Design a protein around this ligand. Sequence first.
Ligand SMILES: CC/C(=C(\c1ccccc1)c1ccc(OCCN(C)C)cc1)c1ccccc1
Ligand SMILES: CC/C(=C(\c1ccccc1)c1ccc(OCCN(C)C)cc1)c1ccccc1
Ligand SMILES: CC/C(=C(\c1ccccc1)c1ccc(OCCN(C)C)cc1)c1ccccc1
Ligand SMILES: CC/C(=C(\c1ccccc1)c1ccc(OCCN(C)C)cc1)c1ccccc1
Ligand SMILES: CCCCCCCCCC(=O)N(CCO)C[C@@H](O)[C@@H](O)[C@@H](O)[C@@H](O)CO
Ligand SMILES: CCCCCCCCCC(=O)N(CCO)C[C@@H](O)[C@@H](O)[C@@H](O)[C@@H](O)CO
Ligand SMILES: CCCCCCCCCC(=O)N(CCO)C[C@@H](O)[C@@H](O)[C@@H](O)[C@@H](O)CO
Ligand SMILES: CCCCCCCCCC(=O)N(CCO)C[C@@H](O)[C@@H](O)[C@@H](O)[C@@H](O)CO
Ligand code: NA
Ligand code: NA
Ligand code: NA
Lengths: 263, 263, 263, 263
Amino acid sequence: SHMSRKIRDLIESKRFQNVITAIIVLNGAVLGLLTDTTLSASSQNLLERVDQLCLTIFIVEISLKIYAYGVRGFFRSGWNLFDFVIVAIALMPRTFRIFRVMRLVSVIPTMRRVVQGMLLALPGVGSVAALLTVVFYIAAVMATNLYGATFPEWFGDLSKSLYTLFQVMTLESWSMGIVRPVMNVHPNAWVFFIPFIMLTTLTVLNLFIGIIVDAMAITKEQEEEAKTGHHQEPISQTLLHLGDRLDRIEKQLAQNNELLQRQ
Amino acid sequence: SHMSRKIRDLIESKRFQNVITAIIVLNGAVLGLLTDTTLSASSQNLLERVDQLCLTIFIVEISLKIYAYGVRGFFRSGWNLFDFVIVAIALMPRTFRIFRVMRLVSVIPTMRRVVQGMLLALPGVGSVAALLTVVFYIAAVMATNLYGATFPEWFGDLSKSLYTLFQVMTLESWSMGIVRPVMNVHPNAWVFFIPFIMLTTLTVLNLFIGIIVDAMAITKEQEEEAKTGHHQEPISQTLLHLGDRLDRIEKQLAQNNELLQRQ
Amino acid sequence: SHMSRKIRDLIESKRFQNVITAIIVLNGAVLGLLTDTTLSASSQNLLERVDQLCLTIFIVEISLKIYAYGVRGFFRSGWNLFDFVIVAIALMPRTFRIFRVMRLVSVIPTMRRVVQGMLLALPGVGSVAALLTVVFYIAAVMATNLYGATFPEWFGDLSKSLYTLFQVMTLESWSMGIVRPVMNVHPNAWVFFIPFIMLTTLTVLNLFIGIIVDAMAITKEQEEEAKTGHHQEPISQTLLHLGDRLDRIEKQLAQNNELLQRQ
Amino acid sequence: SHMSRKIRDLIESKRFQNVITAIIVLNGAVLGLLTDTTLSASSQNLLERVDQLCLTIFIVEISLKIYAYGVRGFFRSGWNLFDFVIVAIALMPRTFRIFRVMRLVSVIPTMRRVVQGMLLALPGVGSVAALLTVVFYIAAVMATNLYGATFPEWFGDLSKSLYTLFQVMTLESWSMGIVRPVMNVHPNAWVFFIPFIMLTTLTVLNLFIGIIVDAMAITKEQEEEAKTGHHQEPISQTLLHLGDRLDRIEKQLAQNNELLQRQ
Ligand SMILES: CC/C(=C(\c1ccccc1)c1ccc(OCCN(C)C)cc1)c1ccccc1
Ligand SMILES: CC/C(=C(\c1ccccc1)c1ccc(OCCN(C)C)cc1)c1ccccc1
Ligand SMILES: CC/C(=C(\c1ccccc1)c1ccc(OCCN(C)C)cc1)c1ccccc1
Ligand SMILES: CC/C(=C(\c1ccccc1)c1ccc(OCCN(C)C)cc1)c1ccccc1
Ligand SMILES: CCCCCCCCCC(=O)N(CCO)C[C@@H](O)[C@@H](O)[C@@H](O)[C@@H](O)CO
Ligand SMILES: CCCCCCCCCC(=O)N(CCO)C[C@@H](O)[C@@H](O)[C@@H](O)[C@@H](O)CO
Ligand SMILES: CCCCCCCCCC(=O)N(CCO)C[C@@H](O)[C@@H](O)[C@@H](O)[C@@H](O)CO
Ligand SMILES: CCCCCCCCCC(=O)N(CCO)C[C@@H](O)[C@@H](O)[C@@H](O)[C@@H](O)CO
Ligand code: NA
Ligand code: NA
Ligand code: NA
């Protein structure tokens, strides 16, 4: 309709996106000031008043979108479902008001395309995250049984062991703080710890390198799908078939010159 | 035979794989609860009873596979030999029961293909792991001779030195904890330590980047060999010959247009 | 003109570049000696005299360039504008004299091309640096509200929280030094900290891997643009179109052999 | 000659390489045992006797090579010049006997090809290592002037500052150990330190990623030059010209079909 077109063309404009962006920055700025313990009683009501003013602008913005696109059209996008929940949770009877700043990711398209590539990369590294989980669990059980009676603060139970093993994987005070003290009581503790470090830092790097490389390609390819309007063959698919394609055109040229030979 | 076909088609099904998967998760879960020092005497017999129930299911599962595939056919796979040893060791007269959870890697195909790529990548980095070993040995000998008489807790013998040099390579308390104390007695100790850190962190990164990049390619190529049923030319082989192949087709086209020129 | 050509051909020579290079190294060397608190009163006047001698050589060098290239021609380059400001600030009525050594980057072409590639790579990672900023701000606000009353030295205000969260992201004493003490008072603090570490170290790596890979390509391509004198298609553009280009030449060859078929 | 051919064909054999390899491992093993402070007086003469036995085998091995290849032919290789110096220094009137184990790199071909790729990669990263040097020098001068009077143990002079800044770059105790203490006296010290960390860890990663990627390609290409007997076009050269080459063959095919069109 006419009204469901003037409103939709306003929502898609960069001026509307900029206004909503400024309101999200204002909301985070006042929630930042609200961390000041030394504030006046009047300053707090004034800042929380600006928080309500921000939140009610988002309600008008979400309603504008639901009217302009429809219920099926608006809730079709996952980013719009996220936007809705962020705003709708503020009306549900909470130190997590600052999570409202996460809307900067969904409202700024370049930021939305960066996080999107990372989210789409996650399924690809599912097996590596599972492999790291298995290694942490087997290690936490072993550490609890081996060192829990002598080192209860660190390996007292499975939870204590999982936390310590995470600390050890991040290399934080692993030797001076954990393994050298454990070694005064258990001299061969390095046989557990050193291989654990080698195996976990390798797997974490594989997990991070994987997400980074896949998010880089997924983003680049979605950028090209947006530009050409058609499906982009993943770079690995092109790379796997590069040889196959190259030697097919060589055979076509040898057969091509065989026909020219008889002339 | 008929019976050696109904059984083999059950073993290959996703329902059988899921049941075995759930039994491996149950086994790890009860071994996890068995780390509770405050458990009842009855709770322990009950949990260890569930451990026997899990292990006897694996015995029936392994026997099903040896009947369905044969001794040569079953022990042909390296993953099946691993599965066998994990179960067979439990009957050999041991805090390493939790290692039974490693079966999640061999039973879940995606996980099996992740670890497989890493294992196949290891020979390629053999020279770098040897280079890092040589650097650690030469360094441990030097550190023992230089600092062992004044710093016996850290460089007292070769074993103490290897452990400290590993701690130093992981950058854990290397300066405040080891090198600043060593420097009060030996002012030029940084001439040993700083180059050691530079050389070892570079080589470890090379070792890890190597395993990660090769495991990524080996996996991608095995996935394509499974899909096409034929050998996949490694990406580096395609990359090395890309120029050679491209200019061969240029020469073929120049010769092709020379034949067309006379027409 | 004649004089505006003998001077410009001297400025572009490698002997002039080497002389200016040696004067920049001399300037840094005397500013290095000037950090000696135990120096003589005469040694300081002697060293600062060498500093004036260095700076006045740069004034003659900049003036030579402004005469040889013109005001529009000299200030057209961004590296020349930088050179000018470094020298002109020394005449403006300052422990930042050592920043004069940054001129080694602008005067040595290989160094200038390394920093240039990094600067040109920065816009590409703008969204990731913004994403890391958003995560740090949301986290600093949450940390101030959660732990500021019980841990005022570390999370007392937003500034204290931002600094501690940066320390935690660099993994420096994050557990033994910050999170284990916070956990005696707040047992579930690891629910905030562990996900914060996972999310920030991933994003920082993405930011650094991005700058490094883009600077590597931008440099390689600018080197080729200098060699060929024409625009170089970015590697990603070539990679995205590799499939498209390869199958277009296959169709051209199938159509080519269809014409030869009728002969 | 006949004798200068039986000897050269022995030197190139894998049995001779294996024997020399075992003697290098024996030499390192006895130098390792010689770090035992609790040894007998007789054990030391016995071990040092094995050291002379090892070293005299290397003298016969080097002489065999100089006779078989000639002075110009033997000293033509850089690896042979290294081998010579390692052995010849042992006869020059020294805790650096363990450096004799470095011969394992030059005698084992796969190890020799790994280190060679790294050495050939170093010139390519010369500008980045210079950039990191400039950043460390400018930073050391600033730190000495800013914090040397209040923190003399860490920033007392330029040498103390360079060591502390290296510790800070490796993130070792940078905050709890150095910057939080510096901040009690100088509240804005984080303005120096935090940007220094960001800039140096980025540049070190660039330096290491560069050496690793170039050593990986240089090795792969030298392996292919050994296999084909001809110069291998660097992968980046192939990548830069991939577009140029692909569209040249498209134009050749359009011109090719124009000739077929008139038939
Ligand atoms: C170009 C996008 C992509 C993808 C992808 C394709 C479709 C949907 C989502 C992601 C990808 C990710 C993982 C994967 O395999 C996991 C095991 N591997 C270790 C083999 C195979 C392909 C990818 C990214 C970078 C390089 C190569 C592929
Ligand atoms: C595609 C798989 C592969 C392999 C590979 C081939 C057959 C069996 C197993 C592994 C590889 C690994 C190492 C190698 O050379 C070691 C020295 N180099 C430093 C040259 C050469 C090739 C490889 C993986 C990623 C990139 C390039 C090659
Ligand atoms: C070859 C130079 C280049 C560039 C570049 C092009 C023009 C000017 C400046 C930089 C680049 C950088 C970022 C970018 O997209 C950001 C999101 N991405 C995650 C998709 C797309 C292209 C680039 C560098 C390395 C690999 C790929 C591209
Ligand atoms: C394939 C070997 C090679 C080389 C190389 C060529 C000849 C002799 C020695 C090394 C290389 C190294 C550095 C370089 O440029 C430095 C600036 N760059 C940032 C542009 C350009 C080429 C190289 C290695 C990996 C990828 C690309 C090139
Ligand atoms: C992928 C890695 C996943 C790591 C998971 C960590 C779980 C941590 C649970 C836990 O330990 N606690 C929360 C339950 O209350 C108790 C803590 O308060 C704390 O006291 C202990 O963690 C320390 O004493 C152990 O060294
Ligand atoms: C690739 C890296 C390989 C590192 C290999 C480490 C070997 C460690 C052997 C060892 O040191 N001990 C086990 C033998 O009993 C003794 C320990 O119990 C402990 O006391 C000492 O390690 C410390 O005192 C040294 O700072
Ligand atoms: C991208 C990351 C950006 C991090 C930004 C850090 C801002 C730090 C500002 C600040 O904290 N101070 C400067 C203002 O004077 C005060 C300091 O002097 C110091 O005392 C405190 O930082 C500590 O007490 C906190 O643990
Ligand atoms: C690329 C990075 C290059 C770093 C270069 C480090 C030079 C270190 C020289 C030096 O400091 N000393 C050797 C000269 O004798 C003195 C030491 O013995 C020691 O006491 C001091 O380093 C500490 O007090 C400083 O915190
Ligand atoms: Na660290
Ligand atoms: Na520490
Ligand atoms: Na650390």
